[PDB]
Design an enzyme around this catalytic site. Sequence first.
Site, PDB file in Angstrom:
ATOM      1  N   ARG B  53      53.745  39.875  46.558  1.00  0.00           N
ATOM      2  CA  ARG B  53      52.790  40.400  46.928  1.00  0.00           C
ATOM      3  C   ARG B  53      53.261  41.293  45.176  1.00  0.00           C
ATOM      4  O   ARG B  53      52.016  41.275  45.043  1.00  0.00           O
ATOM      5  CB  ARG B  53      52.049  41.514  47.431  1.00  0.00           C
ATOM      6  CG  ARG B  53      51.080  42.359  47.890  1.00  0.00           C
ATOM      7  CD  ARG B  53      50.481  42.731  48.186  1.00  0.00           C
ATOM      8  NE  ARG B  53      50.386  44.173  49.189  1.00  0.00           N
ATOM      9  CZ  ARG B  53      51.000  45.124  48.705  1.00  0.00           C
ATOM     10  NH1 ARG B  53      50.294  45.140  47.403  1.00  0.00           N
ATOM     11  NH2 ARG B  53      51.526  45.561  49.591  1.00  0.00           N
ATOM     12  N   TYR B 106      28.569  30.176  38.836  1.00  0.00           N
ATOM     13  CA  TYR B 106      28.523  29.256  39.961  1.00  0.00           C
ATOM     14  C   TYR B 106      27.908  30.421  40.703  1.00  0.00           C
ATOM     15  O   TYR B 106      28.018  31.516  40.991  1.00  0.00           O
ATOM     16  CB  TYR B 106      30.169  29.289  40.013  1.00  0.00           C
ATOM     17  CG  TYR B 106      30.801  28.948  41.054  1.00  0.00           C
ATOM     18  CD1 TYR B 106      31.092  28.031  41.827  1.00  0.00           C
ATOM     19  CD2 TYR B 106      31.579  29.930  42.514  1.00  0.00           C
ATOM     20  CE1 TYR B 106      31.603  27.685  42.344  1.00  0.00           C
ATOM     21  CE2 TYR B 106      31.800  29.386  43.469  1.00  0.00           C
ATOM     22  CZ  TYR B 106      31.638  28.077  43.420  1.00  0.00           C
ATOM     23  OH  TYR B 106      32.332  27.745  45.833  1.00  0.00           O
ATOM     24  N   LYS B 203      39.979  22.930  42.084  1.00  0.00           N
ATOM     25  CA  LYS B 203      39.168  21.851  41.627  1.00  0.00           C
ATOM     26  C   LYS B 203      40.170  21.027  40.742  1.00  0.00           C
ATOM     27  O   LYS B 203      41.112  20.403  41.598  1.00  0.00           O
ATOM     28  CB  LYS B 203      37.305  22.391  40.775  1.00  0.00           C
ATOM     29  CG  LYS B 203      37.008  23.533  41.942  1.00  0.00           C
ATOM     30  CD  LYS B 203      36.881  22.956  42.722  1.00  0.00           C
ATOM     31  CE  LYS B 203      35.746  24.310  43.473  1.00  0.00           C
ATOM     32  NZ  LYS B 203      34.655  25.031  42.307  1.00  0.00           N
TER      33      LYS B 203
HETATM   34  C1  PLP Z   1      52.794  45.839  54.301  1.00  0.00           C
HETATM   35  C2  PLP Z   1      51.836  47.225  54.805  1.00  0.00           C
HETATM   36  C3  PLP Z   1      50.641  46.788  54.360  1.00  0.00           C
HETATM   37  C4  PLP Z   1      50.661  46.248  53.150  1.00  0.00           C
HETATM   38  O1  PLP Z   1      50.066  44.748  54.240  1.00  0.00           O
HETATM   39  P1  PLP Z   1      50.889  43.847  52.630  1.00  0.00           P
HETATM   40  O2  PLP Z   1      50.672  42.145  53.703  1.00  0.00           O
HETATM   41  O3  PLP Z   1      52.077  43.902  51.926  1.00  0.00           O
HETATM   42  O4  PLP Z   1      49.522  43.749  51.972  1.00  0.00           O
HETATM   43  C5  PLP Z   1      49.603  47.773  55.001  1.00  0.00           C
HETATM   44  N1  PLP Z   1      49.972  49.054  55.626  1.00  0.00           N
HETATM   45  C6  PLP Z   1      50.806  49.487  56.142  1.00  0.00           C
HETATM   46  C7  PLP Z   1      50.906  50.016  57.429  1.00  0.00           C
HETATM   47  C8  PLP Z   1      52.137  47.913  56.312  1.00  0.00           C
HETATM   48  O5  PLP Z   1      53.408  48.643  56.703  1.00  0.00           O
HETATM   49  C1  PLP Z   2      34.538  26.657  42.722  1.00  0.00           C
HETATM   50  C2  PLP Z   2      34.327  27.086  41.857  1.00  0.00           C
HETATM   51  C3  PLP Z   2      34.276  28.316  41.846  1.00  0.00           C
HETATM   52  C4  PLP Z   2      34.587  28.934  43.171  1.00  0.00           C
HETATM   53  O1  PLP Z   2      36.374  29.203  42.789  1.00  0.00           O
HETATM   54  P1  PLP Z   2      37.343  29.270  44.674  1.00  0.00           P
HETATM   55  O2  PLP Z   2      38.640  28.267  44.735  1.00  0.00           O
HETATM   56  O3  PLP Z   2      36.190  28.501  45.873  1.00  0.00           O
HETATM   57  O4  PLP Z   2      37.215  30.685  45.151  1.00  0.00           O
HETATM   58  C5  PLP Z   2      34.325  28.848  40.179  1.00  0.00           C
HETATM   59  N1  PLP Z   2      34.393  28.515  39.295  1.00  0.00           N
HETATM   60  C6  PLP Z   2      33.712  27.896  39.625  1.00  0.00           C
HETATM   61  C7  PLP Z   2      33.386  26.736  38.178  1.00  0.00           C
HETATM   62  C8  PLP Z   2      34.122  26.454  40.707  1.00  0.00           C
HETATM   63  O5  PLP Z   2      32.878  25.520  40.491  1.00  0.00           O
END
Ligand code: PLP
Ligand code: PLP
Lengths: 390, 390, 390, 390
Positions: B53, B106, B203
């Site tokens: 992350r 978009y 894309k």
């Molecule tokens: C690790 C954790 C998160 C965060 O999750 P991520 O998948 O790292 O974003 C949130 N809440 C608890 C209790 C966690 O242990």
């Molecule tokens: C498809 C597209 C998006 C959105 O992207 P996602 O990966 O589907 O979330 C944004 N801008 C343009 C110009 C796109 O063609």
Amino acid sequence: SDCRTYGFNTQIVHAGQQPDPSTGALSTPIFQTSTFVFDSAEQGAARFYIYTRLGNPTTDALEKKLAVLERGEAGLATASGISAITTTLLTLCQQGDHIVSASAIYGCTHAFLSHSMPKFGINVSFVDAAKPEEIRAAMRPETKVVYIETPANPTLSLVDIETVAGIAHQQGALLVVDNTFMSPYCQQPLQLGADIVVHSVTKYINGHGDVIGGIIVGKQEFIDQARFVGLKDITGGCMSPFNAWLTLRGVKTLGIRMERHCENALKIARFLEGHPSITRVYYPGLSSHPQYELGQRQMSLPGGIISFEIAGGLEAGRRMINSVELCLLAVSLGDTETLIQHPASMTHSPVAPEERLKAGITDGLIRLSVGLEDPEDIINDLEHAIRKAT
Amino acid sequence: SDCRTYGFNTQIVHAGQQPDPSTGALSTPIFQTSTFVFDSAEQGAARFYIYTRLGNPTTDALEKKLAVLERGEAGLATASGISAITTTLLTLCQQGDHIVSASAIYGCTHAFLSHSMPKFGINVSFVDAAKPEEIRAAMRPETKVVYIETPANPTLSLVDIETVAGIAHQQGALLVVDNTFMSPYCQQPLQLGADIVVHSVTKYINGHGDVIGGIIVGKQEFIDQARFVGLKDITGGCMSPFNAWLTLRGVKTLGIRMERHCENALKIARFLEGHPSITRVYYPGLSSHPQYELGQRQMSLPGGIISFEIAGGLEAGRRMINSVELCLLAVSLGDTETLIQHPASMTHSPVAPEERLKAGITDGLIRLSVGLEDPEDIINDLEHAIRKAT
Amino acid sequence: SDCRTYGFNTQIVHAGQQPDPSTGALSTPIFQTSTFVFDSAEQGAARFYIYTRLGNPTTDALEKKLAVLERGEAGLATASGISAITTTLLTLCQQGDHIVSASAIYGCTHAFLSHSMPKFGINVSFVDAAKPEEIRAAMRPETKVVYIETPANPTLSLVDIETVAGIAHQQGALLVVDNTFMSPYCQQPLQLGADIVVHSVTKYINGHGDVIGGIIVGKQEFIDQARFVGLKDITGGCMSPFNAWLTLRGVKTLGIRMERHCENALKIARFLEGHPSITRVYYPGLSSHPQYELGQRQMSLPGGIISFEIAGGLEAGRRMINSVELCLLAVSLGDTETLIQHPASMTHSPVAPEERLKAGITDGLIRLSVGLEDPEDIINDLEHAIRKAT
Amino acid sequence: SDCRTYGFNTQIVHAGQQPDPSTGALSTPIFQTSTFVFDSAEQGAARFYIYTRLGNPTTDALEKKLAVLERGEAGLATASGISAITTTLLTLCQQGDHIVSASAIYGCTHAFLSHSMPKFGINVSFVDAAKPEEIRAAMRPETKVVYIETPANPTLSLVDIETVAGIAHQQGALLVVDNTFMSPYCQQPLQLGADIVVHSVTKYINGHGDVIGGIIVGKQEFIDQARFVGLKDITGGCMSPFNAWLTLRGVKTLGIRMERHCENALKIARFLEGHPSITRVYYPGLSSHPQYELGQRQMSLPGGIISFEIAGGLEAGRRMINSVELCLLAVSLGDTETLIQHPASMTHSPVAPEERLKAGITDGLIRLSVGLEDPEDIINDLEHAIRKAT
Ligand SMILES: *Cc1c(COP(=O)(O)O)cnc(C)c1O
Ligand SMILES: *Cc1c(COP(=O)(O)O)cnc(C)c1O
Ligand SMILES: *Cc1c(COP(=O)(O)O)cnc(C)c1O
Ligand SMILES: *Cc1c(COP(=O)(O)O)cnc(C)c1O
């Protein structure tokens, strides 16, 4: 037949899944696609699968399974546990709204609530959620959500879900519970009155230390909004189909994993409680835990996480983690390997010592995520390191 | 040596990547992990990789490559194109701020800007960005961002990046450009004065129709905020390492793919412009395009997307897409297969016809994403379907 | 420390694996590469990793882990269980050599030994390996290998590994044991005198129904020949790095899975033995098994496979498998889902009934691979189907 | 419609593939399963998909695509190029049979033919296949197969496929051609009379340096035997579904990749031929190649591989490869990165110098696999290294 009628282990294995009708493949196929095709103009309008950002058959299987396991109507998978939390709260709240949150919450969640929400006009009051009266006293006409985590780090304190749900509902708010620590195998917040459950699947649900992801479970009406507004128009927090497939695979063993994690953790907690170099041991399975009886009613097992304080403060904690040979130094939890961390010297080293103390992080506090190794080997490693450190 | 000194095709292949030092593996390994381990308490504090992350070696390679290709300092990968856009804008803006946005953007981006932003206290003014004076006239003391897309659907109109960047900067705002349509192989907004570039890698960058993802490129100072606040504390929009690895693999062929997409598209556009059943053809490579000379200065190739209007309105467009045998009916673009859609009968069927008309979507408008097939086969399929539909 | 000194569950989790030194990644990276690079001409000659067909870091981790678990020197991963068997035997044997094999072996293995080996000049004598005197009587000056499987389908008969190893060795031959049915968690043939162990990892070792693969474990000198001659110059039976990574992931839970499989299977076997519509139940955990005491000495658990005969022959067996609602009809075993098959109507339908009878396959014989569901649900499903079928 | 009627680029993109009927997913799903389920006893007998070792929907798509591209009836995917070769030859041949093989073949193939085959009673005669009369003179009543590779390392000599096919067929033998070097985009042996084509997909067909695999293409009757006997009962050389999916993805760009590889290689070959420090350049696109006109009739492009001899023998070759900064030192070919090797100091260092000389490997010979980088950058790197080395 209906998966919701079978036992919990049967549901873990089968819920949300079935052999592929077209091919008979038993494993859920990995639909690693971005594009879905329509047979005609008319089918394209009727659907308006279309696009993995809207939904995907692999991810749908995971969502349906977790909904069954939490006894909720619907599920929604996300890119991370943090995305599950923020997609939920940003769907529910807008400028002028208010949240009452536990103070003893995951660090990143605290940062979102303390800094990000107020910059969007959403105010947050932090309270000690072990005291339900503090939740009640903080509720305002604008409160939309009460947010809790249980058990909560760093000392594994608890929150009475059923009591808090009743308070939240009487005052017109929803209760959101982060159930990451327990998994649905050990605690079911929706059955106790919570409205929405979130998890980081990164921890126990996947269990294999190789997926970052989240899940949201709740009523169909809310999940539809979290999907078609929250994910689509706010966070863009999609789970990839491959991560969904890995999480489906990891969750197959959730029941047997949680049983072994908790059996191992109870043995280790009792060893630590008998050790004269250990001043305190925080574990819901020890009868000295301040909320022991609440834990016995609310949790089917006491969990796989232990915290404990080693004699000798900061330098003893550092010497201890530098002396383990089997436990691995890391900040995650819920993996098959035993993981250990010393927050005062690792994650909270630049925080002022008196500021860590108010946060419940003493200089000697160690957190342990107990894995699937032989508990005798884990205990021998801890004993070796504790003796050296003291 | 330094990858930033080589030719663009060399950079496509090599930038951000090198053989694994520990093993010599040429392919970037898939670091499909959630957890990273520290060697000691001291190393854990110093790092405070830690957690996917925060960052991941596979994803880092993709980020570094795309930064080189856009001539930016740093990159940040995300769970989707929409997450790239919202992580960027939610990092930059807070309650009381303002955005000037192109109207021709978009659809999902429009929904975020028109409904989600104002609920967080962030106001948005939509303008015709083909007219830079409309951008200037909409700027306010509170304007933090000017947001543009070029080329823009549905008629492939353009925005003069360099001119708009100068206006935005004189009035104290940043310019964010969605460069998805072109890819860095065909247009480089940062070289023309844009501050931040976003893409849906879904894309052309990935190009293989099997990854949903986004990327953000800009200055290190901004990218650090987008990572450690935007992703960590707002959207939780992580890209999974496997999706990053697939995108690295897809981008290896970006140059040869874009050359073939555009060579094919120009042939098809000229065929359509000569066809008496086709009333209009929108393609930057045709000299009749209203902004043709601007496109020749700003874009190295005219792109792989064409829009065109078939004689006979809604029913002719529906008959046409129902008569193709090779083109596939879908709503994505940038895949190796040729994709076709008829918005008035597919995506915009429940929108009022006069409301589609103001949005530039006529009843006969067809959008084509030209693939890597033989252009003669694509042309024969279009000719077969057009003749039937009319 | 040395992984070979820890308890078996600790070894399951940790053996062959460690955090990546370069990055700290806890999960073994997926080295999905075909090519490895050298730093200089001199390093390229010295190595003569080079090429995944020779070896790969992900696959090496799996090989080292399984070698630890079987108490062997070295491991070699393959494309399938059948490739593990044929790479082994084709490395060991040439034209003019002889093999003594159990008759009660896996079907595909039987086809290789009965038809393929003799066409390469390698003769095979099949014997009843439950009678070690038949093995002795079949050995010739040319015998290189005695080949056994235990337990063996279809009635789960056993072979005394230690006794057979002593006979083979006195007569100058190697003993090869297919340990697929048991996994190293339940039986360790090398500790009982076997020279080489083979597995289909497709079954319990992976355990998740999503990998086809094999493994060979034995002395370093033999494994080197199986790798650099058998795989390189005969079968070309490489395991892909992704399959190795999935098998590493699946084997993390081998101990807890085998415990639950066997606990469930014993309950189901006792239910079937008490059922008046079931004429026979074949399970090593039932004291009526003809080799019960041998099984108690040689196996730590009685396994997760049961065979049983339903009253009423072919049509009752067909009605039974057509009446289950939870058990899935399939021919594999060792998955997390309970799988059921009726050979006389499924796999052996075109075999003459008297020819099935000599092979131990009666018309009413059913084979069950017991999964991780609640055993009460499995028993209820079997009871429902048995009652209907009779 | 029928994919076999479209142009070759259209076939590359579409042959063997279609949107998933059940879901509309455009990408071929990854059927990463070992187990397939039956709906009833009757369906299980009728099928006797069943098991990935027999077949798999993802792998089937790859097999069908490559069959279309080679103009053959059927395809069979394998774990490696070597497995494609040995599964083919071990299916066709038994004790007492004979093979006539080119001497200029891949090293591992030579080891199989020179050492493994004779130990199974299968004799092999090696000849100079550039001289079809030597093939004829070596044929015996027992000859089942003539085996050739073209172009052949190390000097890129050719074999006249059509002439050799006619000789083999008149004498009652099959012709097997390893077409790895060319890919079906550049050479089609079945159209010239070959009976069976094999490839290592590890090279150009996948093209991305991340898959080890093979493919066999030929008549349905033979492929059925190679599948149900060769793979099932001899080598157990299965391709995993994930590797098949990656190869499907890589082959989408085969046409554009081969065009760029060959355009780059011709430029580099001409540069080397003009360089006074380079004594010889071996490339089918240079008119001085001894079989130039044959290559122009048999190959649509001259390929992406070049060999050349640097002045100054062994030490100059070593200095040269130690002086490149962009080309990577490795032994594979067909990747998107340019790869270089110096056999006399790398792969053949322990071979006696006079034994390398008879094998066509002079001390100064360098082999280059030309990638997709800018050819100017490749040429500049070669020029830099050649000047240093001399
Ligand atoms: C690790 C954790 C998160 C965060 O999750 P991520 O998948 O790292 O974003 C949130 N809440 C608890 C209790 C966690 O242990
Ligand atoms: C498809 C597209 C998006 C959105 O992207 P996602 O990966 O589907 O979330 C944004 N801008 C343009 C110009 C796109 O063609
Ligand atoms: C399934 C099995 C095999 C074959 O393994 P594959 O991975 O299918 O090739 C061999 N032996 C036994 C005992 C098996 O159960
Ligand atoms: C690389 C190669 C092979 C071997 O293929 P693998 O996939 O490595 O087993 C066979 N023939 C040729 C011409 C090759 O280049």
